[PDB]
Amino acid sequence: SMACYGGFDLYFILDKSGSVLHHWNEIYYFVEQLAHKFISPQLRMSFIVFSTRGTTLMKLTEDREQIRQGLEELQKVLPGGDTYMHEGFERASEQIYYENRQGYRTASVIIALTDGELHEDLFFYSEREANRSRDLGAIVYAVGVKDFNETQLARIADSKDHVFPVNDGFQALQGIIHSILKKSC
Amino acid sequence: SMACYGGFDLYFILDKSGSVLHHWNEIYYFVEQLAHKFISPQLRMSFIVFSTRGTTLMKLTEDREQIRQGLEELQKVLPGGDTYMHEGFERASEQIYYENRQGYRTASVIIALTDGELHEDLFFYSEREANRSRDLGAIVYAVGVKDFNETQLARIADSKDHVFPVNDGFQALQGIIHSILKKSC
Amino acid sequence: SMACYGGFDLYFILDKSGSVLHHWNEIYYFVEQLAHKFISPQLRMSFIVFSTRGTTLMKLTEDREQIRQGLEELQKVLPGGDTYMHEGFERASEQIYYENRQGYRTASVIIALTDGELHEDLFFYSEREANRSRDLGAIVYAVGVKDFNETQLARIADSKDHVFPVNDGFQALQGIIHSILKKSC
Amino acid sequence: SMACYGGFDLYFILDKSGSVLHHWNEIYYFVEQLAHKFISPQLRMSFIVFSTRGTTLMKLTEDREQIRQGLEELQKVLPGGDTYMHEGFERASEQIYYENRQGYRTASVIIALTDGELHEDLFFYSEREANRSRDLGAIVYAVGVKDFNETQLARIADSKDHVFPVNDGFQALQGIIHSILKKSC
Amino acid sequence: SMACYGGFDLYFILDKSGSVLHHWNEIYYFVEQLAHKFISPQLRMSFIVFSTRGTTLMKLTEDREQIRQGLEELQKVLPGGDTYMHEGFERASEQIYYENRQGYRTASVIIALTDGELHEDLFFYSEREANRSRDLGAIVYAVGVKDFNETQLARIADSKDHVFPVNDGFQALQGIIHSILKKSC
Amino acid sequence: SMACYGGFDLYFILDKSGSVLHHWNEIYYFVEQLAHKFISPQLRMSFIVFSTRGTTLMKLTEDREQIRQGLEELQKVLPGGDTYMHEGFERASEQIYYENRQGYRTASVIIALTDGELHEDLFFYSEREANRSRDLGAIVYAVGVKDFNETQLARIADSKDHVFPVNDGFQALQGIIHSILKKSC
Ligand SMILES: [Mg+2]
Ligand SMILES: [Mg+2]
Ligand SMILES: [Mg+2]
Ligand SMILES: [Mg+2]
Ligand SMILES: [Mg+2]
Ligand SMILES: [Mg+2]
């Protein structure tokens, strides 16, 4: 609807698995640059990392000092481990569920950065948990690095229109985030 | 979305035109029964009347004393005048717009009570304004009295499934309202 | 769309197969009731019969004298033969295609009267041809005679909401036709 | 799709909680009536019960002797315990997932029999698990016992059109199952 | 629908506000080149300009002499004033409404050329009026000048797929126009 | 659905009409490229050619020796004749219908290679038969050669997103085919 958003919650779900070793710097830069472009307290963001497990590195916050510290932490991430992306979505869903209980109309947006190199069962669990996120009200974007398959990530994201490569995705999502911020109450 | 509702705002849009002279008691008691069944401050309601013009008899409120006074004023309504239903929707939309700016996730539900006897241009304006209410985030129900045409009221309401006869309307909408209240945060 | 209809074309597709032998009066009088209720030249109608083959008994017309003669011919129908309903839809679609070439915005409505007792391949062909009618712009209703299967007829009609028992058929369809006629330009 | 079904898998999810103590006969009889109405090996069925926990009483089978034994086990059920309906759906989803891996085009139909008296968190889990069933290809019907709330059950079922009262739900589902069996390869 | 179009009405809604000062040449050239590429009387067009107010510079017409004169007038347009785009859509909708009353099946297409630099309330009114145009049967395209926000223009146009930059948009729209003309009755 | 595919059936519908006389090597190379990249018996393919008539050059098969011989025959194709694409779809639908009767959950994908230069009535027949393919469960992609109109091919394909130019077709469809093979049971 045309109803404004009382909240804007941005959840970064970040692949730090072994396979993205040579792409972590561009994953980090993507996140850092969106953060530095949108410094308004109207936008809250969370940093979630995943490899062998999914962990909330920084819980959802409007506080730019906490965001600064979270980004410093992200810059120091050492890629390694498996690619259990579904746990990244679990970390988002847990937070979205809690936020829902506050009763605000929120643009709950997920940006998942990954190379899409997920083993069969892991992809299945990821699609399941992404659907779970959507059930809680989330809009899911997937930004692919390296040799990601767009159709594969389109099962994680809301649609194929919600899937971008890293460089194109940065420009596209900057516009989307701007639009959502203009649509804030 | 499975996200709970931070608000539940019920807008009664009530036909008080000349054509409903023998049916006002049915309309009033429909409203009175619902108001008396759901006394929780979690439910806010507004009473809008329309004939020659559309007027907000009681602005959206959770206050049961205000609601009591509103019901007492509704009881004394004397049907008469034309059927400018679109103005009834205008009164609802104006309030919905204002409430939107607060940024809460709200079940904004319209219940329009009418015989559906709208002249051609008046029907056109009504559908336009009902669409406008939907754009603001409203769910429109139509409850028909007299010999109402279900297909006609289906263009005002969200769908044919949002159209009920007056004698069956209470039981179905009591259920709907109960369900929404159980989905309150 | 809120745009008015430049035309209203009503296509009766009528089962005259062996299985409805003693139910023909029920079928005919449903048709006659509607025809005599709606005498406006704004409504054009065609009468199509089917059993072993499908045949246009009366081509689409606004002319009430032609409609009178068509009705007289329908009265005298002698049921018998197979149930090749798909040919009945073929007769409607051929006319719909022709009318389409005139370029008017038309409510093209099919009402199919049948017991739905179609053998497997015949049902397949019927669903195919009903879909083809929809592709040409038709809205398909099915009115069930005898102990019909609602879900089966829902494959032919637009949805389960477009299926009615013959006993309740008139009341529902007369309302629908009245609404479409009010939506005429 | 007009494509026939290579399989037809019917999953009964049966409430045996304390709240249905006086209504188990209605629940059992619904299942018994359907099972013995459709004795074709083309229809496979599973009986799942739930109260404090969800348990597969009879795994999906076409074998009528197993079905007989399953029904005799249902005759012995003593209602009691909580209403953890989500676990009933879990038992269904586990079987559907396994069946999916066989690669057949199957009509996977769930019929959940319940009074809908679920506490808030339990209802949340149930809607979540029902959605998960739908993700795996299931069509969910809910058949209501006692004075159930159809809007609430519509959150579990596919839609309000997939919700039926128990005392006139055998007639509705019998027709639906007949139709699905006629759409079998 | 596969039905051919009895008419093809193309509405250019053209931003002549102060913010498009360096881009009017681009906007005019886009219109001029499309008009010159499609001279068939089967295509009718209207030129609407907007800044502080929205005005119909040339009402819908098939007459190429009137179009020639309209283009001459458009060429002399001097950018300046506010950006009340909603009025441009009001000018289109008024014409669409009148044309609807004729009862022809028409491809009513809007092309809005703008930088999308609308202040908050103006954007709200614009989205409201674009929705109204859609309700009347219009398909809305947005062609952006400058570094426009695609997501923002996607609120005006039917979808993000209906949003184009100037060069891609020209090629895309001449293909769309060619296709619609091939679909003429 | 998240349910894996029991089968993956790929139907190439290839334009060999006079209008593509100097472009056959483009069309052939596209097919040869895809065949050679995907040699898994999990993928079955059919080669259909059309000009004046539509003919199945190679019936649906997983046999790579038959595929090898099929490609050899495709290489030798000599363009000429009319563009009766609808017959190409008829050859695909015939096979899809047969395979449906086996009752496996199959990804039935059509890739139509054409310049889209179809005369009015031929385009009508093509849209009709493509719709029929979809009704049987097919997903339709169109890959355009020469100066094709994307909007026109979008009427044959499922959507505009299912239409690709021949120079961008391989990358997109390779990714799609890979994804479907990964989603095999
Ligand atoms: Mg990895
Ligand atoms: Mg009145
Ligand atoms: Mg018969
Ligand atoms: Mg219980
Ligand atoms: Mg401006
Ligand atoms: Mg050709």
Author numbering:
A (entry chain B), B (entry chain E), C (entry chain F), D (entry chain D), E (entry chain C), F (entry chain A): 36 to 220
What does the original paper state about this entry?
By using a genetic approach, two PA cell surface receptors have been identified: TEM8/ANTXR1 (tumor endothelial marker 8/anthrax toxin receptor 1) and CMG2/ANTXR2 (capillary morphogenesis protein 2/anthrax toxin receptor 2). TEM8 and CMG2 are type I transmembrane proteins with three domains: an N-terminal, extracellular von Willebrand factor type A domain (vWA domain), a single transmembrane spanning domain, and a C-terminal cytosolic domain. CMG2 was reported to have approximately 1000-fold higher affinity for PA (Kd = 170 and 780 pM for the Mg2+- and Ca2+-bound complexes, respectively) than TEM8 (Kd = 1.1 µM and 130 nM for the Mg2+- and Ca2+-bound complexes, respectively), the latter of which is about the average level of integrin-ligand interaction. The MIDAS (metal ion-dependent adhesion site) motif in vWA domains can exist in either of two conformations, much like the integrin I domain: closed (low-affinity ligand binding state) and open (high-affinity ligand binding state).
Here we report the high resolution structure of the TEM8 vWA domain. We found that the vWA domain contains a chelated Mg2+ ion and a bound pseudo-ligand (i.e., an acetate ion from the crystallization buffer) in its MIDAS site. Our crystal structure contained six TEM8 vWA molecules (labeled as A, B, C, D, E, and F) in the asymmetric unit (also unit cell). Three monomers were related by a non-crystallographic three-fold symmetry to form a trimer, and two of such trimers (A-B-C and D-E-F) formed a hexamer with an overall ball-like shape through a two-fold axis perpendicular to the three-fold axis. In this hexamer, the MIDAS ligand binding area from each monomer was blocked, which would definitely interrupt the interaction between TEM8 and PA. Thus, the observed TEM8 hexamer is most likely an artifact of crystal packing. Consistent with their sequence homology, the structure of the TEM8 extracellular domain is very similar to that of CMG2 and the integrin A domain. It should be noted that three acetate ions were found in each of the six TEM8 molecules and were well defined in the electron density map. One of them appeared to correspond to an analogous ion in the CMG2 structure, which acted as a mimic ligand of the side chain of D683 in PA and occupied the MIDAS coordination site. Taken together, the TEM8 extracellular domain contained a conserved Mg2+-coordinated MIDAS motif that assumed an integrin-like open conformation.
